[PDB]
Amino acid sequence: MKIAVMTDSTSYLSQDLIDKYNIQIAPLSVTFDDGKNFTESNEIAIEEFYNKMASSQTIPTTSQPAIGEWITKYEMLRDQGYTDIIVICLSSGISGSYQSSYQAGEMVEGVNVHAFDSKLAAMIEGCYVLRAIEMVEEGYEPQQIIDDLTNMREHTGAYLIVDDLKNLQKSGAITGAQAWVGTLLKMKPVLKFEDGKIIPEEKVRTKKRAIQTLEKKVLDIVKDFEEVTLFVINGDHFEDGQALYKKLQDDCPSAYQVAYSEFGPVVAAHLGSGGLGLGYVGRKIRLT
Ligand SMILES: CCCCCCCCCCCCCCCC(=O)O
Protein backbone atom coordinates (compact mmCIF):
# COMPACT_ATOMS: atom_id res chain seq x y z
CA MET A 1 0.00 0.00 0.00
CA LYS A 2 1.09 3.50 -1.02
CA ILE A 3 -1.72 6.09 -0.95
CA ALA A 4 -1.60 9.36 -2.90
CA VAL A 5 -4.01 12.29 -2.56
CA MET A 6 -4.74 14.64 -5.46
CA THR A 7 -7.42 17.10 -6.42
CA ASP A 8 -8.57 19.54 -9.07
CA SER A 9 -7.55 23.18 -9.21
CA THR A 10 -10.74 24.54 -7.61
CA SER A 11 -9.58 23.34 -4.16
CA TYR A 12 -7.44 26.55 -4.19
CA LEU A 13 -4.77 25.18 -1.88
CA SER A 14 -1.84 27.44 -1.13
CA GLN A 15 1.27 26.72 -3.17
CA ASP A 16 3.12 26.14 0.12
CA LEU A 17 0.82 23.18 0.83
CA ILE A 18 0.89 21.93 -2.78
CA ASP A 19 4.71 22.02 -2.59
CA LYS A 20 5.02 20.56 0.91
CA TYR A 21 2.87 17.49 0.29
CA ASN A 22 3.63 17.24 -3.48
CA ILE A 23 -0.08 17.42 -4.32
CA GLN A 24 -0.89 16.68 -7.93
CA ILE A 25 -3.53 18.93 -9.49
CA ALA A 26 -5.81 18.37 -12.47
CA PRO A 27 -6.53 21.93 -13.67
CA LEU A 28 -9.78 23.48 -14.81
CA SER A 29 -9.85 26.23 -17.44
CA VAL A 30 -11.70 29.45 -18.27
CA THR A 31 -12.48 30.95 -21.71
CA PHE A 32 -13.43 34.58 -22.43
CA ASP A 33 -15.66 35.96 -25.19
CA ASP A 34 -12.59 36.87 -27.30
CA GLY A 35 -11.48 33.22 -27.36
CA LYS A 36 -8.81 33.78 -24.69
CA ASN A 37 -8.31 30.65 -22.59
CA PHE A 38 -5.99 29.48 -19.83
CA THR A 39 -5.36 26.72 -17.30
CA GLU A 40 -5.92 27.38 -13.58
CA SER A 41 -2.68 27.84 -11.66
CA ASN A 42 -1.26 29.72 -8.70
CA GLU A 43 0.85 31.47 -11.37
CA ILE A 44 -2.22 33.39 -12.63
CA ALA A 45 -2.64 36.95 -11.34
CA ILE A 46 -6.17 37.05 -9.92
CA GLU A 47 -6.49 40.86 -10.07
CA GLU A 48 -5.94 40.80 -13.84
CA PHE A 49 -8.58 38.07 -14.21
CA TYR A 50 -11.21 40.26 -12.56
CA ASN A 51 -10.10 43.17 -14.76
CA LYS A 52 -10.59 41.04 -17.87
CA MET A 53 -13.98 39.87 -16.60
CA ALA A 54 -15.05 43.46 -16.03
CA SER A 55 -13.96 44.48 -19.55
CA SER A 56 -15.89 41.59 -21.16
CA GLN A 57 -19.26 42.16 -22.82
CA THR A 58 -20.03 38.44 -22.41
CA ILE A 59 -19.49 36.47 -19.20
CA PRO A 60 -16.64 33.94 -19.47
CA THR A 61 -17.20 30.20 -19.50
CA THR A 62 -15.24 27.45 -17.74
CA SER A 63 -14.33 23.84 -18.42
CA GLN A 64 -13.83 20.80 -16.27
CA PRO A 65 -10.52 18.96 -16.69
CA ALA A 66 -11.06 16.99 -19.89
CA ILE A 67 -11.47 13.27 -19.29
CA GLY A 68 -8.08 12.74 -20.93
CA GLU A 69 -6.52 15.23 -18.50
CA TRP A 70 -7.19 13.08 -15.41
CA ILE A 71 -6.04 9.90 -17.17
CA THR A 72 -2.64 11.48 -17.77
CA LYS A 73 -2.31 12.36 -14.08
CA TYR A 74 -3.30 8.94 -12.76
CA GLU A 75 -1.00 7.37 -15.36
CA MET A 76 1.68 9.78 -14.17
CA LEU A 77 0.93 8.76 -10.59
CA ARG A 78 0.67 5.06 -11.54
CA ASP A 79 4.09 5.21 -13.18
CA GLN A 80 5.44 6.69 -9.93
CA GLY A 81 4.36 3.52 -8.11
CA TYR A 82 1.42 4.48 -5.90
CA THR A 83 -1.16 1.76 -5.20
CA ASP A 84 -4.17 3.92 -4.26
CA ILE A 85 -5.14 7.48 -5.20
CA ILE A 86 -7.70 9.50 -3.23
CA VAL A 87 -9.13 12.18 -5.55
CA ILE A 88 -10.93 15.19 -4.06
CA CYS A 89 -13.21 16.88 -6.59
CA LEU A 90 -15.38 19.97 -7.01
CA SER A 91 -19.08 19.45 -6.28
CA SER A 92 -20.78 17.20 -8.79
CA GLY A 93 -23.77 19.57 -8.46
CA ILE A 94 -21.98 22.38 -10.32
CA SER A 95 -19.33 20.62 -12.43
CA GLY A 96 -18.44 17.54 -14.38
CA SER A 97 -14.98 17.41 -12.78
CA TYR A 98 -15.98 14.62 -10.35
CA GLN A 99 -17.52 12.32 -12.95
CA SER A 100 -14.61 12.86 -15.32
CA SER A 101 -12.26 11.93 -12.48
CA TYR A 102 -14.31 8.76 -11.83
CA GLN A 103 -14.52 7.81 -15.49
CA ALA A 104 -10.82 8.48 -16.03
CA GLY A 105 -10.06 6.29 -13.02
CA GLU A 106 -11.79 3.25 -14.50
CA MET A 107 -9.42 3.59 -17.46
CA VAL A 108 -5.95 3.41 -15.84
CA GLU A 109 -4.85 -0.12 -15.02
CA GLY A 110 -2.61 -0.99 -12.12
CA VAL A 111 -3.86 1.63 -9.65
CA ASN A 112 -7.01 1.92 -7.58
CA VAL A 113 -8.70 5.33 -7.86
CA HIS A 114 -11.08 6.56 -5.14
CA ALA A 115 -12.86 9.66 -6.39
CA PHE A 116 -14.61 11.73 -3.75
CA ASP A 117 -17.33 14.32 -4.41
CA SER A 118 -16.66 17.15 -1.95
CA LYS A 119 -20.09 18.70 -2.75
CA LEU A 120 -18.41 22.10 -2.31
CA ALA A 121 -15.61 24.20 -3.79
CA ALA A 122 -12.58 26.41 -3.05
CA MET A 123 -10.70 25.90 0.18
CA ILE A 124 -13.67 24.07 1.72
CA GLU A 125 -13.04 21.46 -0.98
CA GLY A 126 -9.35 21.90 -0.09
CA CYS A 127 -10.02 20.89 3.52
CA TYR A 128 -10.90 17.38 2.35
CA VAL A 129 -7.49 17.17 0.65
CA LEU A 130 -5.74 18.21 3.87
CA ARG A 131 -7.83 15.77 5.90
CA ALA A 132 -7.04 12.92 3.51
CA ILE A 133 -3.29 13.61 3.59
CA GLU A 134 -3.32 13.70 7.40
CA MET A 135 -5.05 10.32 7.54
CA VAL A 136 -2.60 8.74 5.08
CA GLU A 137 0.28 9.79 7.36
CA GLU A 138 -1.67 8.27 10.25
CA GLY A 139 -1.71 4.84 8.59
CA TYR A 140 -5.35 4.74 7.54
CA GLU A 141 -6.49 2.62 4.59
CA PRO A 142 -8.35 4.12 1.60
CA GLN A 143 -11.86 2.99 2.58
CA GLN A 144 -11.35 4.38 6.08
CA ILE A 145 -10.34 7.71 4.54
CA ILE A 146 -13.34 7.85 2.21
CA ASP A 147 -15.62 6.97 5.14
CA ASP A 148 -14.08 9.71 7.28
CA LEU A 149 -14.44 12.29 4.48
CA THR A 150 -18.06 11.25 4.00
CA ASN A 151 -18.68 11.87 7.71
CA MET A 152 -16.90 15.22 7.43
CA ARG A 153 -19.18 16.17 4.53
CA GLU A 154 -22.18 15.76 6.87
CA HIS A 155 -20.87 18.69 8.94
CA THR A 156 -19.53 20.96 6.17
CA GLY A 157 -21.27 23.81 4.45
CA ALA A 158 -21.07 27.35 3.15
CA TYR A 159 -23.07 30.53 2.67
CA LEU A 160 -22.18 33.11 0.04
CA ILE A 161 -23.03 36.49 -1.43
CA VAL A 162 -22.35 38.08 -4.83
CA ASP A 163 -22.78 41.60 -6.20
CA ASP A 164 -25.03 40.50 -9.07
CA LEU A 165 -26.69 37.18 -9.77
CA LYS A 166 -26.05 37.46 -13.54
CA ASN A 167 -22.88 35.32 -13.70
CA LEU A 168 -24.38 32.52 -11.61
CA GLN A 169 -27.64 32.85 -13.55
CA LYS A 170 -26.25 32.92 -17.10
CA SER A 171 -23.76 30.14 -16.36
CA GLY A 172 -26.49 27.87 -14.95
CA ALA A 173 -24.73 27.62 -11.59
CA ILE A 174 -27.64 28.67 -9.33
CA THR A 175 -30.63 26.43 -8.62
CA GLY A 176 -34.14 27.48 -7.65
CA ALA A 177 -33.61 31.18 -8.46
CA GLN A 178 -36.08 31.40 -11.38
CA ALA A 179 -38.27 33.72 -9.28
CA TRP A 180 -35.47 35.95 -7.93
CA VAL A 181 -35.08 37.21 -11.52
CA GLY A 182 -36.60 40.48 -12.71
CA THR A 183 -34.44 43.22 -11.19
CA LEU A 184 -34.01 41.42 -7.86
CA LEU A 185 -35.42 44.27 -5.72
CA LYS A 186 -31.94 45.61 -4.83
CA MET A 187 -31.88 43.45 -1.66
CA LYS A 188 -28.65 41.44 -1.60
CA PRO A 189 -29.02 37.70 -2.33
CA VAL A 190 -27.67 35.36 0.34
CA LEU A 191 -27.06 31.89 -1.06
CA LYS A 192 -25.99 28.60 0.45
CA PHE A 193 -24.77 25.20 -0.61
CA GLU A 194 -27.28 22.37 -0.23
CA ASP A 195 -26.43 18.80 -1.27
CA GLY A 196 -23.76 20.15 -3.64
CA LYS A 197 -26.00 22.77 -5.32
CA ILE A 198 -26.24 26.55 -4.78
CA ILE A 199 -29.71 27.71 -3.71
CA PRO A 200 -31.26 30.96 -2.45
CA GLU A 201 -31.44 31.34 1.29
CA GLU A 202 -32.56 34.86 2.13
CA LYS A 203 -32.81 38.36 0.71
CA VAL A 204 -31.44 41.17 2.89
CA ARG A 205 -31.67 44.90 2.30
CA THR A 206 -27.94 45.76 2.31
CA LYS A 207 -24.57 44.22 1.65
CA LYS A 208 -23.33 45.00 5.16
CA ARG A 209 -26.37 43.16 6.53
CA ALA A 210 -25.71 40.31 4.10
CA ILE A 211 -22.25 39.96 5.66
CA GLN A 212 -23.77 40.01 9.14
CA THR A 213 -26.23 37.34 7.99
CA LEU A 214 -23.34 35.19 6.73
CA GLU A 215 -21.78 35.34 10.19
CA LYS A 216 -25.02 34.71 12.07
CA LYS A 217 -26.08 31.70 10.00
CA VAL A 218 -22.73 29.93 10.23
CA LEU A 219 -22.10 30.68 13.93
CA ASP A 220 -25.54 29.24 14.81
CA ILE A 221 -24.67 26.00 13.01
CA VAL A 222 -21.11 25.49 14.25
CA LYS A 223 -21.91 26.17 17.91
CA ASP A 224 -23.09 22.55 18.04
CA PHE A 225 -19.87 21.04 16.67
CA GLU A 226 -17.09 19.54 18.78
CA GLU A 227 -14.45 20.99 16.40
CA VAL A 228 -14.75 24.01 14.09
CA THR A 229 -12.77 25.36 11.14
CA LEU A 230 -14.15 28.48 9.43
CA PHE A 231 -12.97 29.89 6.10
CA VAL A 232 -13.63 33.41 4.90
CA ILE A 233 -13.20 33.14 1.14
CA ASN A 234 -13.09 36.54 -0.51
CA GLY A 235 -13.57 37.73 -4.07
CA ASP A 236 -12.24 40.99 -5.52
CA HIS A 237 -13.54 43.45 -2.87
CA PHE A 238 -10.71 43.41 -0.33
CA GLU A 239 -12.51 45.22 2.50
CA ASP A 240 -15.45 42.78 2.25
CA GLY A 241 -13.38 39.79 3.29
CA GLN A 242 -11.17 41.74 5.69
CA ALA A 243 -14.24 43.01 7.54
CA LEU A 244 -15.77 39.54 7.85
CA TYR A 245 -12.47 37.94 8.88
CA LYS A 246 -11.80 40.63 11.52
CA LYS A 247 -15.35 40.26 12.89
CA LEU A 248 -15.00 36.48 13.20
CA GLN A 249 -11.64 36.85 14.95
CA ASP A 250 -13.34 39.09 17.51
CA ASP A 251 -16.58 37.13 17.94
CA CYS A 252 -15.25 33.61 17.90
CA PRO A 253 -13.36 31.87 20.68
CA SER A 254 -9.83 30.85 19.87
CA ALA A 255 -11.04 27.24 20.01
CA TYR A 256 -12.43 27.88 16.50
CA GLN A 257 -9.92 27.81 13.66
CA VAL A 258 -10.60 30.88 11.49
CA ALA A 259 -8.81 31.08 8.14
CA TYR A 260 -8.84 33.23 5.01
CA SER A 261 -8.63 32.31 1.34
CA GLU A 262 -9.72 33.69 -2.04
CA PHE A 263 -11.56 32.51 -5.13
CA GLY A 264 -9.56 31.62 -8.21
CA PRO A 265 -10.70 32.39 -11.75
CA VAL A 266 -12.91 29.33 -12.36
CA VAL A 267 -15.11 30.03 -9.36
CA ALA A 268 -14.80 33.80 -9.84
CA ALA A 269 -16.02 33.50 -13.45
CA HIS A 270 -19.33 32.16 -12.11
CA LEU A 271 -19.63 34.52 -9.13
CA GLY A 272 -18.68 37.76 -10.82
CA SER A 273 -17.43 40.69 -8.80
CA GLY A 274 -18.02 41.01 -5.07
CA GLY A 275 -18.10 37.31 -4.22
CA LEU A 276 -17.73 36.45 -0.56
CA GLY A 277 -18.16 33.06 1.10
CA LEU A 278 -18.15 31.85 4.67
CA GLY A 279 -17.64 28.12 4.87
CA TYR A 280 -17.35 25.74 7.79
CA VAL A 281 -16.11 22.24 8.62
CA GLY A 282 -16.89 20.40 11.86
CA ARG A 283 -13.26 19.32 12.15
CA LYS A 284 -9.96 20.87 13.23
CA ILE A 285 -8.30 20.65 9.81
CA ARG A 286 -4.49 20.68 9.66
CA LEU A 287 -3.70 23.87 7.74
CA THR A 288 0.10 23.56 7.85
C1 LIG B 1 -16.86 29.44 1.53
C2 LIG B 1 -17.03 28.56 0.27
C3 LIG B 1 -17.67 29.36 -0.86
C4 LIG B 1 -17.85 28.50 -2.11
C5 LIG B 1 -18.48 29.24 -3.30
C6 LIG B 1 -18.41 28.41 -4.59
C7 LIG B 1 -19.10 29.09 -5.76
C8 LIG B 1 -19.23 28.16 -6.97
C9 LIG B 1 -19.78 28.90 -8.21
C10 LIG B 1 -20.01 27.92 -9.38
C11 LIG B 1 -18.70 27.45 -10.01
C12 LIG B 1 -18.87 26.39 -11.14
C13 LIG B 1 -17.54 25.92 -11.69
C14 LIG B 1 -17.72 24.83 -12.78
C15 LIG B 1 -16.44 24.49 -13.51
C16 LIG B 1 -16.66 23.60 -14.80
O1 LIG B 1 -16.76 22.35 -14.56
O2 LIG B 1 -16.73 24.22 -15.91
Numbering used by the authors: 1 to 288
Kindly provide excerpts from the paper associated with this entry.
Staphylococcus aureus FakB1 is a prototypical bacterial FA transfer protein that binds palmitate within a narrow, buried tunnel. Here, we use a combination of X-ray crystallography, NMR spectroscopy, MD simulations, site-directed mutagenesis, and functional biochemical assays to characterize the membrane-bound conformation of FakB. This study focuses on FakB1, an FA transfer protein from S. aureus that binds palmitic acid (16:0) before presenting it to FakA for phosphorylation and exchange with the membrane. The bacterial class of FA transfer proteins is called FakB, and the bound acyl chains are completely enclosed within the protein interior. The open conformation arises from a conformational change in the dynamic region that rotates helix α8 outward to uncover the FA-binding tunnel and reorganizes the adjacent α8-β9 loop into a new amphipathic helix.
The rotation of the dynamic Arg173 residue away from the protein is predicted to expose and promote the opening of a portal to the buried FA. We determined the X-ray structure of FakB1(R173A) to determine if this was the case, but its overall structure was identical to that of FakB1 (RMSD = 0.210 Å). The hydrophobic interface and the Ser171-His270 interaction are apparently sufficient to maintain the connection between the dynamic region and the body of FakB1 even though the absence of Arg173 does expose the first eight carbons of the FA to solvent as predicted. FakB1(R173A) is a few degrees less stable than FakB1 consistent with the loss of the hydrogen bond connection to Ile94, and as expected, FakB1(R173A) was catalytically inactive. Although the removal of Arg173 is not sufficient to generate the open conformation in the crystal lattice, its disengagement is essential for the conformation change to occur. Arg173 covers the bound FA and provides a key hydrogen bond connection with the body of the protein.
